């Protein structure tokens, strides 16, 4: 989408995976979807260094709406859980230096059953803009036809444009096309800043594996589509929650960097380990994800329960990720000729190699003919950065 | 098995899950299966508090053997990887106040292809006794009939007895029989100190779930046969390795205590986090596992992606575990009438309840009328101990 936005993948926080559609503020007040949750989350985004690291968008997902539109046919926030309204929330979020994301649905209802946007595309776009919304995630439930789906996504893109407000447009269009026909990603890219391709992540290594395997299986179809202004969205970061081991968290962070994924954390910033916070705030890995060239990486090799992925970076640099998919035993040795990496460009005539994950350590100069040897933990990833050089 | 051993579930360390059949001492000298690996583990078991916590059996799994028997037809350890031989390693381990476990196979080869014990059961038992072995894990590969399987497990049990040395006898008899015939656990218990029931564990939450689900599905057949001298073995503890989140590690420790499982760690004692060490050494949870009554716990309830398990303990106490199997969202609320716990006696007229996992915290007195409410992390477990006030 050519709106000047998302020139690097968008970074922020989105409530869905960790908080879902919890409406019971009486018995579960700390996890119900409420304006207080987002206000406190904004405070922590500032005070715990998230904003500084690049996480700028504080995003509301489904279940913020009142059950029905107001007298003027406009959407309203739930009166009990959002009594002060979205415009006041956005004012608060902006006063913290952050940006506010909201959610809506292309069809007659949101996936959780709340008012849908079909018939109100321009009204809803203008409403969000008046409120100060800076990002829209547009879901695909309750759409009567493929034609409705595509028309609605295009219409909402145009209607947001007409407001004159800069609004990141996050689409689930390709995901909801798969029951019927395969997506045309040139069109989607025309209308969307990023798009969900695959099933929702949950708090499990099984889910990470499913997402990565779908992505690498489909990579000839999606990798080259991505670039500044339009990204593939493999769904939220779930680091900091409950179901991933440390090595599985490292794998998610590394591979979302490789994939030029939007980085939307879905966790509870009020209750997050120092290890998870340091990984999510890792400056060198975020710099890979945010590389200005904006070319998505890919799976280079797979075999013997190993994977090698790589991503071309600005200035003849490359990121390389090695995944050990064997889920038994200990760290496994993996060796590769550096000439096989980065299309034989990364280390011609030499490269300086820095390991970034699981721990940061300089590995040194590797000439074009040399071999790189690593050990990778089960379900873990070694992430390396290669800097092309003439020196040594 | 009435040999006076395994009166509580055996506790120790077993190389297989973490170190497997790594024979490459040239390129991986610190991880290959060798005498040096077991000496290093023995030293740390003493110096890092594992033995004090109760972990006593340092166990060798498959791939210790030389490719062939010796001139006299006996098993021998690999001459390069075990240059001083098993008897000498057992001497060292005994000098640390520990016990040594070894591995053999009822069939013609071990699962990894080394010499099997079929046709050599008495020689092999006497060899192990002469070496000072304290425990035998007896695998089931390369056995061509259910009759040979059964007769081999019984024959080795008897041959061990006949040596006169006390040797814990760990069998895989049910696991290898189950595809073809339902095992008779009364008979198995007669011949074995503990027995593997289900597929090998690996370093994954998926494996833990599979083991728990098989155990609760089969619990009417296996729970009552367990007790002092004879335990169900749901396989190694893999806490401290790579594949489990903290809450999944908590779930494994809590449920292996509920199940009166043997506690064979398979990890790298040289490289283990302080938090994994503290969980594996948790005195209150080990005390539940090691409860002298030796009554195996069981699944009480399942529904809404929660499970409740409980275990009766000595002196009117009970342990209760609540598992959250929903793998999305946040800590999820579960409540249960305490009159539903411990068959209705745990908290009649009242009980004091202490949470042990994920953190220790006294919850207070609960009357017979009360309800217990808790939030359980996704894939995590809350483990409680209830003491009747009477
Ligand atoms: C509504 O839609 C219209 C188009 O459909 C959209 O305007 C388009 O997008 C951007 C607006 O920022 C324009 O692209 C810029 O064009 C100028 C003209 O030369 C360039 O100098 C700009 O380059 C800078 O920014 C780029 C990032 O966008 C960098 O890559 C670059 O290196 C420079 O730093 C940039 O290309 C584009 O020309 C228009 N197209 C039109 C007007 O036809 C508009 O923004 C949308 N409105 C809203 C509110 O979303
Ligand atoms: C070979 O097989 C035989 C037959 O199965 C086996 O003999 C059994 O040994 C056990 C333990 O040595 C005996 O059980 C003991 O019986 C005596 C009876 O005098 C009891 O005093 C023992 O009590 C122990 O536990 C008490 C609490 O329960 C404690 O006070 C104390 O710690 C006691 O040690 C215990 O119940 C069993 O009677 C015999 N059975 C027969 C038929 O002899 C033998 O051990 C096996 N040998 C080898 C080398 O495996
Ligand atoms: C399971 O095995 C046990 C022992 O092999 C059987 O129990 C024995 O049965 C005989 C005759 O019925 C008795 O004389 C023994 O005293 C029993 N031993 C014990 C320890 O109880 C049992 O019958 C077998 N069950 C099945 C279903 O085959
Ligand atoms: C996809 O859509 C774009 C824009 O409408 C169009 O130019 C392109 O030809 C389409 N691709 C196919 C295969 O139809
Ligand atoms: C071992 O091999 C012999 C020779 O083929 C065979 O007769 C015997 O049944 C085998 N034993 C087992 C337990 O498979
Ligand atoms: C079902 N919706 C949910 C809101 O109800 C989340 O936004 C999810 O990402 C989407 C499915 O893709
Ligand atoms: C295949 N063997 C392996 C040794 O080869 C491990 O002992 C495993 O526990 C058993 C199967 O249950």
Domain range summary for chain B, segments of one domain joined by +: 1-293, 294-390
Catalytic site residues of B? 139, 200
Place of tokens 């583990």: B41
Phi and psi dihedrals of B132, rounded to 5? 80, 20
Distance A380 CA to ligand 7 centre (A): 24
- Domain spanning A294-390: which CATH class is it, in words? mainly beta
Which tokens hold the place of B208?
């833990």
- Let me know the angle formed at the C-alpha of A214 by A208 and A217, rounded to the nearest 5 degrees: 135
Q: For A203, which of B203, B243, B378 is closest by C-beta distance?
A: B378
- Does any ligand 4 atom lie closer than 6 A to the CB of residue A184? yes
CB < 8 Å from A in window 232-251 of B: 241-245, 247-248
Q: Which residue has tokens 């003439």? A: A390
Contacts of B20 in chain A (CB under 8 A): 328-330
The one catalytic residue in A122, A200, A203, A284 is: A200
Please report where in the chains the tokens 């001459």 appear, as a residue. B79
Q: Is B265 exposed, middle or buried (0-12, 13-18, 19+ CB in 10 A)?
A: buried
Testing ligand 7's pocket by substitution, the residue of B111, B201, B211 carrying the most ligand atoms inside 8 A of its CB is B111
Phi, psi of A253 (to 5 degrees): -65, -50
Q: Establish if A333 touches chain B: CB-CB under 8 angstroms.
A: yes
**Chain A touched by B359 (CB under 8 Å):** no
Q: Cβ of B327 and A204 within 8 Å?
A: yes
- Evaluate the CA torsion angle A28, A34, A39, A44 in order and state its sign: positive
**Separation between Cα atoms, residue A254 and residue A17, nearest integer Å:** 20
Residue A316: closest CA among A246, A261, A389: A389
Catalytic, A200? Answer yes
Q: Do A17 and B247 touch (CB under 8 A)?
A: no
Q: Which residues of B touch A246 (CB under 8 A)?
A: 242
Q: Which of A16, A235, A242 to mutate to test the interface with B (most CBs of B within 10 A)?
A: A242
Ligand 1 site residues, Cβ closer than 6 angstroms: A 2-4, 7, 161, 164-166
**A373 CB-near residues (< 8 Å, 6+ apart):** A333, A334, A335
Q: Determine which helix (DSSP H) or strand (DSSP E) holds A191, and give its type and residue range.
A: helix A185-191
d(CA B247, CA B351): 27
Residue nearest to atom 11 of ligand 7 (CA): B200
Q: Is B180 on the interface with A (CB under 8 A)?
A: no
Chain B residues in contact with A327 (beta carbon < 8 A): 202-204, 243
Q: CA–CA separation, B369 vs B387, rounded Å?
A: 16
Token look-up 């929702």 returns A200
Residue A61 touches partner B, C-beta closer than 8 Å: no
| Cis amide leading into B349 (omega within 30) | yes
Radius of gyration of chain B (CA): 21
Q: Which CATH number fits domain B1-293: 3.90.180.10, 3.20.20.70, 3.30.70.360, 3.40.50.720?
A: 3.20.20.70
For B199-228, b where at least 16 C-beta lie within 10 A, e where not — what string? eebbbbbebbbebbebbbebbeebbebbeb
**Shortest Cα distance from A1 to chain B (angstroms)?**
32
The residue to which tokens 């008012």 are assigned: A115
What residues form DSSP beta bridges with A333?
A375
Separation of alpha carbons B131 and B149, rounded Å: 25
Phi/psi for A33 (5° steps) reads -80, 105
The radius of gyration computed from the CA coordinates of chain A, to the nearest angstrom, equals 21
Decide: B6 and B231 in contact? Cβ < 8 Å. Answer: yes
What are the φ/ψ torsions at residue B179 (nearest 5 degrees)?
-55, -25
> Which ranges of chain B does DSSP label H, i.e. alpha helix?
16-19, 35-47, 50-53, 85-95, 121-130, 146-163, 173-177, 185-191, 205-217, 219-222, 246-258, 274-280, 283-289
Question: Tokens representing A35?
Answer: 């304006």
Please tell me if the CB atom of residue B16 comes closer than 6 angstroms to any atom of ligand 7. Answer: yes
Torsions phi, psi for B344 (to 5 deg): 90, -5
To the nearest 10°, report the CA torsion of B300, B302, B303, B304.
Answer: 110
Q: At what angle do helices B246-258 and B205-217 cross, to 10 degrees?
A: 30
Could you say which DSSP state residue B61 is in?
A: -
* Tokens 């980065």, residue located: A342
Phi, psi of A211 (to 5 degrees): -60, -50
Nearest to A244 among B202, B206, B245 (CB): B245
What span, in angstroms and rounded, lies between the C-alpha atoms of A133 and A99? Answer: 8
Distance (Å, whole) CA B285 – CA B287:
5
**Do the domains spanning A1-293 and A294-390 agree at the CATH topology level?**
no
Q: Say if strands A306-312 and A298-303 run parallel, antiparallel, or are unpaired.
A: antiparallel
Token pair listed for B70: 């010796």
Collapse the DSSP code of A70 into the 3-class scheme (helix H, G, I; strand E, B; otherwise coil) and give the result.
coil
Q: State how far the alpha carbon of A328 is from the alpha carbons of B115, B155, B247, in Å.
A: 24, 33, 19
CB A48 within 8 A of CB A92: no
A119, A143 in Cβ contact below 8 A?
no
Q: How far is B241 from chain A (nearest CA, A)?
A: 8
What is the sign of the dihedral through the CA atoms of A65, A69, A72 and A74? positive
Helix (H, G, I), strand (E, B) or coil at A374: strand
Burial grade of B178 (CB within 10 A; 0-12, 13-18, 19 or more): middle
| Cα separation, B197 vs B215, whole angstroms | 9
* Chain A to chain B Cβ contacts (< 8 Å): 89
Discontinuities after residues in chain A (C–N over 2.5 A):
none
Measuring CA to CA, which residue among B169, B229, B232 is closest to residue B195?
B232
In A287-380, which ranges are E strands?
A: 298-303, 306-312, 317-324, 332-337, 350-357, 361-367, 371-376
- Chain A contact for B271 (CB, 8 A cutoff): no
3 state SS of A99 = strand
A81/B104 Cα distance (integer angstroms): 64
Q: In what order do the strands lie in the sheet with A231-233?
A: A231-233, A194-196, A168-171, A135-139, A99-105, A57-59, A11-14, A263-265
Resolution in A: 2.0
Distances (CA, A) of B298 to B216, B223, B288, B307, B354: 7, 7, 14, 10, 20
**Nearest-ligand number for the alpha carbon of B143:** 5
| Strand spans (E) along A42-179 | 57-59, 99-105, 135-139, 168-171
B324, B293 Cβ separation under 8 angstroms:
no
Q: Which atom of ligand 1 is nearest to A167's Cα?
A: 50
């Amino acid at each position: 989408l050519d709106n000047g936005l998302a020139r690097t993948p968008t970074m922020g926080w989105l409530h869905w995976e960790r908080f879902m559609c919890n409406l019971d503020c009486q018995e579960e007040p700390d996890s119900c979807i409420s304006e207080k949750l987002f206000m406190e989350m904004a405070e922590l985004m500032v005070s715990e260094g998230w904003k500084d690291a690049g996480y700028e968008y504080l995003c509301i997902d489904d279940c913020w709406m009142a059950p029905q539109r107001d007298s003027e046919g406009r959407l309203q926030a739930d009166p009990q859980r959002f009594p002060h309204g979205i415009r006041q929330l956005a004012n608060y979020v902006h006063s913290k230096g952050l940006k506010l994301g909201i959610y809506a649905d292309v069809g007659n209802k949101t996936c959780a059953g709340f008012p849908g946007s079909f018939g109100y595309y321009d009204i809803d776009a203008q409403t969000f803009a008046d409120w100060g919304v800076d990002l829209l995630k547009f879901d695909g439930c309750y759409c009567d036809s493929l034609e409705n789906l595509a028309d609605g996504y295009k219409h909402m893109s145009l209607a947001l444009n007409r407001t004159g407000r800069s609004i990141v447009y996050s689409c689930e269009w390709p995901l909801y096309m798969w029951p019927f026909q395969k997506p045309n990603y040139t069109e989607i890219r025309q209308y969307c800043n990023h798009w969900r391709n695959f099933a929702d992540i949950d708090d499990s290594w099984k889910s990470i594996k499913s997402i990565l395997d779908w992505t690498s299986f489909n990579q000839e179809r999606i990798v080259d589509v991505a670039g500044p202004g339009g990204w593939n969205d493999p769904d939220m970061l779930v680091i900091g929650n409950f179901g991933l081991s440390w090595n599985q968290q490292v794998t998610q962070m590394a591979l979302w960097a490789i994939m030029a994924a939007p980085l939307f954390m879905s966790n509870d910033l009020r209750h997050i380990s120092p290890q998870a916070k340091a990984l999510l705030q890792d400056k060198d890995v975020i710099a890979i994800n945010q590389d200005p060239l904006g070319k998505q990486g890919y799976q280079l090799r797979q075999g013997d329960n190993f994977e090698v992925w790589e991503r071309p970076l600005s200035g003849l640099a490359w990121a390389v990720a090695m995944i050990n998919r064997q889920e038994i035993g200990g760290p496994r040795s993996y060796t590769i000729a550096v000439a096989s990496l980065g299309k034989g460009v990364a280390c011609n005539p030499a490269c300086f190699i820095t390991q970034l994950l699981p721990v940061k350590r300089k590995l040194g100069f590797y000439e074009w003919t040399s071999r790189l040897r690593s050990h990778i933990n089960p379900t873990g990833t070694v992430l390396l950065q290669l800097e092309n050089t003439m020196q040594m």
